[PDB]
Ligand binder design. Structure first.
Ligand SMILES: CCC1=C(C)/C(=C/C2=NC(=C\c3[nH]c(/C=C4\NC(=O)[C@H](C)[C@H]4CC)c(C)c3CCC(=O)O)/C(CCC(=O)O)=C2C)NC1=O
Ligand SMILES: CCC1=C(C)/C(=C/C2=NC(=C\c3[nH]c(/C=C4\NC(=O)[C@H](C)[C@H]4CC)c(C)c3CCC(=O)O)/C(CCC(=O)O)=C2C)NC1=O
Ligand SMILES: CCC1=C(C)/C(=C/C2=NC(=C\c3[nH]c(/C=C4\NC(=O)[C@H](C)[C@H]4CC)c(C)c3CCC(=O)O)/C(CCC(=O)O)=C2C)NC1=O
Ligand SMILES: CCC1=C(C)/C(=C/C2=NC(=C\c3[nH]c(/C=C4\NC(=O)[C@H](C)[C@H]4CC)c(C)c3CCC(=O)O)/C(CCC(=O)O)=C2C)NC1=O
Ligand SMILES: CCC1=C(C)/C(=C/C2=NC(=C\c3[nH]c(/C=C4\NC(=O)[C@H](C)[C@H]4CC)c(C)c3CCC(=O)O)/C(CCC(=O)O)=C2C)NC1=O
Ligand SMILES: CCC1=C(C)/C(=C/C2=NC(=C\c3[nH]c(/C=C4\NC(=O)[C@H](C)[C@H]4CC)c(C)c3CCC(=O)O)/C(CCC(=O)O)=C2C)NC1=O
Ligand SMILES: CCC1=C(C)/C(=C/C2=NC(=C\c3[nH]c(/C=C4\NC(=O)[C@H](C)[C@H]4CC)c(C)c3CCC(=O)O)/C(CCC(=O)O)=C2C)NC1=O
Ligand SMILES: CCC1=C(C)/C(=C/C2=NC(=C\c3[nH]c(/C=C4\NC(=O)[C@H](C)[C@H]4CC)c(C)c3CCC(=O)O)/C(CCC(=O)O)=C2C)NC1=O
Ligand SMILES: CCC1=C(C)/C(=C/C2=NC(=C\c3[nH]c(/C=C4\NC(=O)[C@H](C)[C@H]4CC)c(C)c3CCC(=O)O)/C(CCC(=O)O)=C2C)NC1=O
Lengths: 57, 247, 161, 27, 160, 162, 160, 162, 160, 160, 162
């Protein structure tokens, strides 16, 4: 249980942003195991959709 | 006032001014500098452009900034990693991140964390991940954790990772609880994993100082905050925001 | 991101020789056309809001997408569509000044199609909007600059399409 | 220098332009 | 190039190119013919510039040709002429580009480690590129020499 | 910030006492005025932009040097900043009136405001005049008792700035 | 308080109170007389409630007052009852405030660390507050019993 | 921070001098006391919560006013803050004892602490009395020499708060 | 030092030292006398070590003292030997401290920038450090030579 | 293990081992024989250690063996002794590894939440582990018992 | 920050009147040296490291105590910090020269410089001497006409320090 590879799309519902924020919306990061619960909760509270998570190591 | 009358007046002044110049480039330049007036009054057919609102927590006040106030040219150039840029501007963003976290480019000392730089340039870790791993590194613990008590550590970490001063007694209270409980790693994790960091900076943008002109400024911490947004802030070892909010 | 200058320098670096006559000819073809590019860029900069407004009107306003059940039906969603049209116009201007489409491919089309699929954005209506923006820009900037800008708008369209 | 020459020309004729606009739109 | 830097700066602030950045690009394109003519003027005399720079480099630092030096030996000269050729080529690329970036990626990012591995002293590099600077600025006109000298001594400063 | 209920709770908690007759009388007095406070707050939220318009007009009429060259309101940028400050004052005075206590005012407006304006160059006296103008404008719209209650907090703001 | 929460929620968004928040304040001020009556009943019966709830707690868990227990002794039993008096006062504060904020900010933050320093068994505290719930809700009417029991259950969950 | 070895190194480095017999004697003294320091640190780390318990009990029994309403330690939050401060004092006294120098005490505790308590209203005399209580409780567990060594740093903290 | 690193590491997570780093301190302390003896040997033999290292460096790299070299001249050679003396003293500090932290802070952080400003060839510094390492390890026994050799190796790597 | 923390510390700095960490892997391999013998002696004597420690725990606290406690009941006592058996195995693991991370990542992380879910008293934990430490230091050799008691003290502090 | 252009524009905007003869004279003087100042800025930007080298060599030759043990520049870290500060001074002097106004210096160097150097123990007189050496080197490098324009801002920094 080392790392998670997470692809998720958090849209924007509170306002319209003038800057790019394209990579901020659709992204893939590697998240540590001890941090994945909090990160998944944050993505869910933001309204985003977690597309898929795989196990890296 | 009559907007149509003002448009007619500005057009008439444009014609009069263009008359005296007697040079095509001069005429076109002055005509543009009047067409900007006509264009702005035409663009304001709906309401004035929306005022920028900075959201806050229930502990501190929510503030608004007129759109006129921001677009005076003082806007900071945000450093963003696209993961596909040429290595030059990748290094530019990395240097900006070092300048923000350590208050100055510590490559002047030859000090850097090479594997973190390689990871952030390659794309394994985002700029937010790079900032968080950079703040809990050994270097940051040396310059900004050892010489300071937990309160001053809190304040300088606010400046370095959120680009702003603490704005509430509740805020310094909660983050002092976090630091007293979990150390530097916990404090940096709390600062960077918060909603405010993701809203303001996101994954790919280096933090910047959110001082006057960038957004709406609190009044209750004005002098202390602008003491903090100063390169002499580490020179002060007595905490200044817990003391202020207690006083 | 690279321009024509960066592109030719990269090619002659990989091949490993100096800039020859042909490289000079391409560089001059970029340089002499520069004044037209800056005139077009200034024209778009001054009138960006009008261009996006006319394009959005003719391409979207009274189509079903604005009515309820469509992707554009909300104040937030309509503002987001206008914002994306602003993106397209600004980045097409950037690509035109750089005279290269790699900026359009990278800054704009990197993961955009997946984002539009997940969000529910229709790709065909986006292509129509980008096209309408293309003719509006051509009309405002004249035929010479419009032909140049049409290449970048068409690159955007084929990227989404 | 060119822009300053422009500015000098416009400031020498400032009252003329302002009065001309005022007459055009007022009374 | 200058255009790429301006576009990146404008994208950083999420705004169109400013008139200052616009007339920066205007000066960049208006000066294109002179810069290309300069780049060629460097090109014909490539062998002359490189050989004179090598001669001045040996004269200024005998240590490189002295026994025990990193450049000591006849075999090192074949690489020396070729490396000075690379750096002159990078200087011409920067001249046409309008900024120091192509030089940066191709020959500056990682040169410190590259000569750390080969145990090459940085002062040898700075004196050699100063020699190329002197030779080229001698060949070119004063107005062109003023513009090209920046790239040359920028390479010098980056090498150390 | 703290409201009237929280104020009474704090006063009785620092003394380690339960609520006596006086405490319940004060709480009942606050509860009796709640509907009036809500109606006044709704009325102010109705006409906030209006009140700002008349207050700014009255202030700049009685203080014409503010908008002349050399004045601190002489710009569209500075004019917008001034009217946004006026918006701040009205919003937070309405918050204070609704809460029934002046604590939110001191916490989020008055603390550090004089030094903020001293740094910015903002005239404190002219801001006090604008607050007073807002007070006369708001009183007519809210009625007699709501005007007394609402002007208490405007007077608190003016005295804090004074 | 309820008014405080509505005001700070509006303040966070830099707006005036929404119709929902004003309706919330109207509902809170409409129940002021009932809340005052409940708080005055609890205050009038503080001695009886503490006496009876302490009796129930001690019979249910004799281990607290047996030799070797934390509450063993007259002075420690007095401290035990004083804690219950504190929490009853906090419950009355929450009743008048309309929310559990006073309880939360006086007697819930750091309660686990405080009672760990005092060797106080948290299950014993939970049993004590449940006993106080029972004794107090016995005195109140059916409608007010649930209202008081909600604050008591919140406090029990905070201790648990 | 700085420890005894780093202290000698810095003193000789500022002078630019190599180590001589006096410096080697100081280093040998630290190396002699290292085993005692390690035993004391382990014992304290095993019993830190206990020491805090008896010290807090002593302080709040001799000064019950601190925990009654109106006192500085009167709430669960403020009581927890007090015991957290005592925990930090104990941990940094242990750190200083292990290092053999009071530099960490200054840098990580005593720089700006008196100002913080002055702003917060914390009675520094009572804090020092609690530190003295921790000193006497720690000494009994650690033994005679370890008690003298720990009391050096406890007294350093107490005099620093002065 | 070892104690400093262990304590600051424990401080970074707001916790007491674990028995592992207590064994750390115990092992470092039990080895104090050998470190002190090695420091004795290095300090007493500084004068011979500096001269022998200078001769070895200058015979292996004659270009530094050759005309046009950095160490050319009596004063510049004296400065070179002074630098060797500095680094030997720093090695003694690191030996007594049990780690490279004194070397780190006094002579490693910003050393490349210092010598780049001073126009000093870093390969020359590496060669000098290697020569002085060989000279010093010649005096010490195998067990102590192995220990000091790694401090010298860290210095050489930091200069490279 | 100790080499694990050495390697991860080297990775976090992107270079080879420090002289301190070199000494520390040296001390770990040099002390491995004694350490593994200690773990052995704990291993063969586990059945007697757990029984003596459990009897001592029951002897100390009359409350746990009393009704309503998490020690009352034959199967519940078996579960208590099984937790002691697990913890002794983890102590042997931690002795072998030379650090407490095998103890930490099995039996320390989330222990408070697990025993709150089980309703097991945590003072029961500290007293039980003190009992195991006392019984282990008795039969085992003094130098061995030093590190065994250090590990048990760390475990107790983690519980308490 | 400000430049000469912003200063004149603000001076005549606060008065509310167009540019007079003195205004046009100020702008003409500022524009006349513009190409010379840009040439000097290009020279400095191109050869900053060289100027640092001779400036530091002169400073540490005149005051060898700085780099010997017991001096503020005695370590690799402190030497690197010294030369870094010198690079700061050169760059901000170049910025001020191109702007034509000393506002950027007051805003982004002098604001907190004295606090920094008195906290760190940096000798202010030696820093002034280093700035003077930098002035001499950059004047020798960029020509006398641009040397005066560099020297005015170098003197501004030196007077700010002392
Ligand atoms: C600079 C490069 C860039 C692009 C291209 C980009 C596209 C983009 N459009 C978005 C939302 C949106 N975009 C649209 C526009 C679509 N609906 C209409 O019918 C059209 C067919 C079509 C546009 C022509 C709409 C309606 C949304 C809101 C969808 C939702 O939130 O449910 C979002 C989500 C973030 C947000 O809502 O602010 C992105 C990232 N973002 C970028 O940073
Ligand atoms: C490691 C260096 C360091 C220390 C020690 C430190 C102490 C410290 N103590 C605090 C509060 C406190 N500290 C105490 C403890 C005191 N009052 C009691 O009566 C005792 C006599 C005495 C302790 C023995 C109390 C009661 C508070 C709460 C004050 C309040 O919330 O108003 C706070 C403010 C926390 C907040 O925001 O509420 C700090 C920062 N900070 C540091 O960076
Ligand atoms: C465009 C970017 C680029 C550069 C700059 C570059 C230089 C370069 N020079 C090399 C060899 C070398 N180059 C030199 C010459 C220098 N070293 C001495 O210290 C002198 C100071 C100086 C000559 C006076 C030497 C001595 C060698 C080692 C052996 C040889 O001569 O080939 C090598 C190793 C293999 C080879 O010969 O190709 C490289 C990669 N390569 C690149 O891809
Ligand atoms: C260049 C930058 C700039 C301009 C021009 C500007 C105009 C301006 N004129 C104002 C007043 C005013 N201006 C006007 C009308 C005049 N307005 C003109 O556009 C017409 C030619 C003319 C009428 C046909 C009137 C009637 C007022 C009185 C306030 C009001 O309208 O209620 C105000 C409000 C402040 C005050 O009450 O004095 C502004 C901001 N502000 C700026 O920052
Ligand atoms: C929530 C409490 C709060 C207050 C009250 C507050 C006041 C405030 N007013 C500001 C600017 C300003 N405020 C004013 C207003 C004054 N000009 C004069 O003519 C009038 C007397 C008066 C208007 C009635 C002006 C003109 C400025 C612009 C100053 C400048 O940029 O030059 C600014 C700095 C810009 C910013 O908001 O980012 C603050 C912080 N800030 C707060 O967080
Ligand atoms: C207003 C918020 C607040 C609370 C709640 C609070 C609790 C509190 N309880 C205390 C002691 C105590 N509390 C208790 C109560 C426990 N005994 C049994 O286990 C029961 C399960 C349980 C009660 C139902 C006991 C027995 C003591 C005495 C501990 C001792 O003397 O060692 C003390 C220490 C007082 C002293 O002697 O100096 C405090 C501060 N303090 C506060 O400021
Ligand atoms: C304790 C940390 C520390 C170090 C290391 C240090 C080095 C140092 N060496 C210096 C000069 C020098 N150092 C050298 C040494 C070089 N000559 C050869 O090329 C070799 C490659 C190399 C020696 C092995 C030389 C030749 C000079 C004289 C150069 C000059 O005059 O500027 C100077 C300038 C001051 C002076 O000349 O007295 C410093 C500061 N200073 C410090 O505070
Ligand atoms: C190696 C990692 C590990 C640990 C540490 C561990 C502890 C543990 N002990 C358990 C059972 C238990 N353990 C105890 C022990 C308590 N009785 C007395 O109070 C003592 C003070 C104390 C033991 C010293 C008790 C009473 C239970 C019964 C819980 C139940 O079945 O409801 C359980 C629940 C499993 C079950 O009921 O089937 C766990 C998870 N389990 C693990 O996998
Ligand atoms: C442009 C705005 C700016 C300035 C002015 C500035 C000065 C500055 N110099 C510093 C360090 C330093 N600065 C010096 C200066 C040298 N000491 C020698 O004796 C000379 C007299 C003198 C230069 C000629 C030294 C020795 C240090 C290191 C002191 C130490 O850390 O102990 C520091 C501490 C932060 C760090 O070390 O990175 C600051 C803030 N920083 C800024 O961002």
């Amino acid at each position: 249980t080392r790392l998670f590879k997470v692809t998720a799309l958090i849209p924007s519902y509170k306002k319209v942003r003038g800057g790019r924020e394209l990579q901020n919306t659709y992204f893939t990061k590697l998240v540590e195991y001890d941090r994945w619960f909090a990160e998944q909760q944050r993505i869910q509270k933001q309204g985003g959709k977690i597309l898929s998570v795989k196990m890296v190591a | 006032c009559s907007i149509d009358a003002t448009i007619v007046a500005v057009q008439e002044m444009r014609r009069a001014a263009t008359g005296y110049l007697k040079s095509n480039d001069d005429k076109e330049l002055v005509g543009s500098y009047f067409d900007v007036i006509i264009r702005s009054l035409n663009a304001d057919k709906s309401d004035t452009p929306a005022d920028v609102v900075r959201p806050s927590s229930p502990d501190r006040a929510g503030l608004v900034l007129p759109a006129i106030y921001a677009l005076a040219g003082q806007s900071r150039p945000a450093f963003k990693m696209s993961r596909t840029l040429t290595s030059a501007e990748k290094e530019r963003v990395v240097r900006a991140a070092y300048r923000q976290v350590f208050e100055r480019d510590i490559l002047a000392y030859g000090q850097s964390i090479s594997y973190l730089d390689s990871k952030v340039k390659n794309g394994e870790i985002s700029v937010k991940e790079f900032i968080r791993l950079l703040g809990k590194s050994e270097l940051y613990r040396k310059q900004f954790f050892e010489p300071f008590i937990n309160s001053r550590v809190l304040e300088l970490a606010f400046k370095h990772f959120l680009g702003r001063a603490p704005e509430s007694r509740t805020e310094v209270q909660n983050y002092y609880s976090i630091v007293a409980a979990q150390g530097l790693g916990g404090l940096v994790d709390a600062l960077v994993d918060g909603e405010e960091y993701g809203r303001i900076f996101g994954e790919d943008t280096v933090p910047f100082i959110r001082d006057l002109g960038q957004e709406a400024q609190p009044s209750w911490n004005w002098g202390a905050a602008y003491s903090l947004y100063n390169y002499a802030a580490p020179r002060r070892k007595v905490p200044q925001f817990i003391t202020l909010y207690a006083d | 991101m690279q321009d024509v200058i960066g592109k030719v320098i990269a090619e002659y670096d990989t091949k490993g020789k100096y800039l020859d006559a042909a490289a000079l000819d391409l560089l001059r073809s970029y340089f002499d056309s520069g004044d037209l590019r800056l005139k077009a860029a200034q024209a778009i900069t001054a009138n960006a809001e009008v261009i996006v407004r006319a394009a959005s009107a003719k391409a979207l306003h009274y189509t079903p997408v604005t009515k309820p059940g469509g992707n554009m039906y909300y104040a937030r969603r309509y503002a987001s569509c206008i914002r994306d049209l602003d993106y397209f116009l600004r980045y097409a201007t950037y690509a035109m000044l750089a005279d290269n489409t790699t900026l359009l491919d990278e800054y704009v089309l990197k993961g955009l199609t997946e984002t539009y699929r997940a969000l529910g954005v229709p790709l065909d209506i986006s292509v129509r909007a980008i096209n309408a923006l293309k003719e509006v820009v051509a009309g405002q900037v004249g035929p010479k600059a419009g032909q140049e800008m049409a290449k970048y708008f068409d690159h955007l369209a084929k990227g989404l399409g | 220098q060119r822009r300053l020459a422009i500015v000098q020309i416009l400031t020498t004729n400032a009252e003329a332009i302002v009065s001309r606009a005022a007459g055009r739109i007022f009374t | 190039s200058v255009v790429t830097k301006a576009i990146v700066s404008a994208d950083a602030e999420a705004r169109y190119l400013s008139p200052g950045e616009l007339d920066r690009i205007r000066g960049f394109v208006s000066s294109g013919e002179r810069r290309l003519r300069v780049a060629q003027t460097l090109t014909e005399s490539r062998e002359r510039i490189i050989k004179q720079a090598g001669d001045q480099l040996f004269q200024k630092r005998p240590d490189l040709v002295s026994p025990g030096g990193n450049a000591y030996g006849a075999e090192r000269t074949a690489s020396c002429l070729r490396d000075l050729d690379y750096y002159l080529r990078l200087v011409t690329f920067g001249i046409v580009a309008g900024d120091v970036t192509p030089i940066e990626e191709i020959g500056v990012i990682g040169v410190k480690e590259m000569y750390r591995n080969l145990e090459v002293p940085l002062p040898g590099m700075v004196e050699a590129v100063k020699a190329m600077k002197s030779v080229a600025t001698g060949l070119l006109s004063g107005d062109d020499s003023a513009e090209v000298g920046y790239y040359f001594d920028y390479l010098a400063g980056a090498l150390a | 910030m703290q409201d009237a209920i929280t104020s009474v709770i704090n006063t009785y908690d620092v003394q380690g006492k339960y609520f006596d007759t006086s405490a319940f009388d004060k709480l009942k007095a606050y509860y009796a005025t709640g509907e009036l406070r809500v109606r006044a707050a709704g009325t102010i939220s109705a006409n906030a932009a209006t009140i700002i318009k008349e207050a700014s007009a009255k202030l700049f009429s009685n203080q014409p040097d503010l908008v002349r060259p050399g004045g601190n309101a002489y710009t569209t940028r500075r004019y917008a900043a001034c009217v946004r400050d006026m918006d701040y004052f009205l919003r937070y005075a309405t918050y204070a009136m609704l809460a029934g206590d002046t604590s939110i005012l001191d916490e989020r407006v008055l603390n550090g405001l004089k030094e903020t304006y001293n740094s910015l160059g903002v005239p404190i006296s002219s801001t006090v005049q604008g607050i007073q103008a807002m007070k006369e404008v708001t009183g007519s719209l809210v009625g007699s008792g709501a005007a007394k209650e609402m002007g208490v907090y405007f007077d608190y703001l003016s005295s804090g700035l004074s």
